Ligand binder design. Structure first.
Ligand SMILES: Cc1ccc(-c2cc(C(=O)O)c3nc(CN4CCOCC4)[nH]c3c2)c(Cl)c1
Ligand SMILES: [Zn+2]
Length: 351
C-alpha cells in the first residue's frame, strides 16, 4: 500500500548531505563566472536567478543554474503562432542599449548572444584551476566538475513587463491557491530562454516561468497553514518526489535503447500541477492517502502520454506532448513501461 512508498522517500532523505556538499561546488564556480561576465559591456546586468537558492535539481548529478539579463523596454513579436516561441524587438530608441551588439535590424539574435556567452565562459573555465571544470557539445552551457557533477547553465532574458497574451488562461490556480495569489504571481517578471523551434530557427526565444515553481511548492495548500502542524500534513511534495524518481529510474533502466531521451522532470512537474488543479482541496492530498494520491498522478500522466496531450501549465495552447516534440512511438513505449509498474505495485522502487 502506502508503506512501500514511505521507505523510498525516507531513503531519498539520506542522500541530502551528499547533494549539499556538491551544491557548494556549483555555487563556487558560478560566482567566478558572474564576476567575469559583469566586466563585459553586454553582460554587465547579468545576475543569478533563484529557482538550494540559485541551484535547481533535474537529475541526481545534474544541476540547472539560470543567469538573468535585465532587458528594459522590450517588445515581443509572436513566432509562427507557436504560443511559446517569440522574437525580441525594442519598443523605441531612447538611449542605445548595451545589448545592441547582437541586433539584426530590429530582431535580437539568440545564436549571437549565446555564442559570446559560451566564449567568455570557455575562457574563465581554464582560469579557475581549483576543480576540474570542462564544457560539453541543447540551448544550455553544460559543465562537468570532478567528472561527476554536471551543471547546465542557461542564459535568460528578464522582462519585468506584464506576461504575454498566450499566458492569459494559464496558471489555473484560482480554485486552489486563489484568484488573489494568481494576480500576485502574474505581477512577477517573466523569462525568455534561447530554446529554438524545430534545421532550427536560432533567433526565437521560449517563455520560461521556472521561478514560479518555488513560489507554489513552498505554499502549496488551499489552507494557509498546510504542513505547518501535525494535523494539516499533506503529501503534495511527496507525490512530486515519487513522480520525479519514477521517470528518473525508468530513464536509468532504459538507457539500453535511448527511447525516453526527450522526457524530463519538467513533463512530470507539469502533469503533477495539473492534478493539483483537479484536486484543489487539502483533503484530496492527505498523508495517509499517499498511495491513492500517487496513483492519481500516475493515472493523469498515463492518460497524458496515451492522448498525446500535456498542456504547458502557463501556456494552455502549447502541447508538450505534440507529434512535433515527442514521437508517437516514445509515448506508447513510456505508456507501456508505467502501465507495467502501476499493474505490478511499482517494482522499480524495491532497493
Ligand atoms: C506551478 C509551476 C511552476 C513552474 C513550472 C515550470 C515552468 C518552466 C517553464 O520554463 O515554463 C520550467 N522549465 C523547467 C526546466 N527546463 C526544462 C526545459 O529545458 C530547460 C529547463 N522547469 C520548469 C517548471 C511548472 Cl511545470 C509548474
Ligand atoms: Zn501541504
Amino acid at each position: 500500500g502506502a508503506s512501500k512508498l514511505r521507505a523510498v522517500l525516507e531513503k531519498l532523505k539520506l542522500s541530502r548531505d551528499d547533494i549539499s556538499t556538491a551544491a557548494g561546488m556549483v555555487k563556487g564556480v558560478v560566482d567566478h563566472l558572474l564576476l567575469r561576465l559583469k566586466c563585459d559591456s553586454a553582460f554587465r546586468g547579468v545576475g543569478l536567478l533563484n529557482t538550494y537558492e540559485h541551484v535547481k535539481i533535474s537529475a541526481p548529478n545534474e544541476f540547472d543554474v539560470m543567469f538573468k539579463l535585465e532587458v528594459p523596454r522590450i517588445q515581443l513579436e509572436e513566432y509562427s503562432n507557436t504560443r511559446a516561441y517569440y522574437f525580441v524587438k525594442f519598443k523605441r530608441n531612447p538611449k542605445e542599449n548595451p545589448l545592441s551588439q547582437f541586433l539584426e535590424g530590429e530582431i535580437l539574435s539568440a545564436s549571437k548572444m549565446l555564442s559570446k556567452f559560451r566564449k567568455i565562459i570557455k575562457e574563465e573555465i581554464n582560469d579557475i584551476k581549483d576543480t576540474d571544470v570542462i564544457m560539453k557539445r541543447s540551448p544550455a552551457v553544460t559543465l562537468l566538475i570532478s567528472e561527476k557533477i554536471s551543471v547546465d547553465i542557461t542564459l535568460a532574458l528578464e522582462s519585468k513587463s506584464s506576461w504575454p497574451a498566450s499566458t492569459q488562461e494559464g496558471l489555473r490556480i484560482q480554485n486552489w491557491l486563489s484568484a488573489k495569489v494568481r494576480k500576485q504571481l502574474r505581477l512577477k517578471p517573466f523569462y525568455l530562454v534561447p530554446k529554438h523551434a524545430k534545421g532550427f530557427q536560432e533567433e526565437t526565444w521560449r517563455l520560461s516561468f521556472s521561478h514560479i515553481e518555488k513560489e507554489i511548492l513552498n505554499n502549496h495548500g488551499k489552507s494557509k497553514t498546510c504542513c505547518e502542524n501535525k494535523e494539516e500534513k499533506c503529501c503534495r511534495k511527496d507525490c512530486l518526489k515519487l513522480m520525479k524518481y519514477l521517470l528518473e529510474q525508468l530513464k536509468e533502466r532504459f538507457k539500453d535503447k535511448k527511447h525516453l531521451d526527450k522526457f524530463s522532470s519538467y513533463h512530470v512537474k507539469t502533469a503533477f500541477f495539473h492534478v493539483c488543479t483537479q484536486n484543489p482541496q487539502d483533503s484530496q492530498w492527505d498523508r495517509k492517502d499517499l498511495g491513492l494520491c500517487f496513483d492519481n498522478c500516475v493515472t493523469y500522466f498515463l492518460q497524458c502520454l496515451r492522448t498525446e496531450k500535456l498542456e504547458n501549465y502557463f501556456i494552455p495552447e502549447f502541447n508538450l506532448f505534440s507529434s512535433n516534440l515527442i514521437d508517437k512511438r516514445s509515448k506508447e513505449f513510456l505508456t507501456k513501461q508505467i502501465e507495467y509498474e502501476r499493474n505490478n505495485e511499482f517494482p522499480v522502487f524495491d532497493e
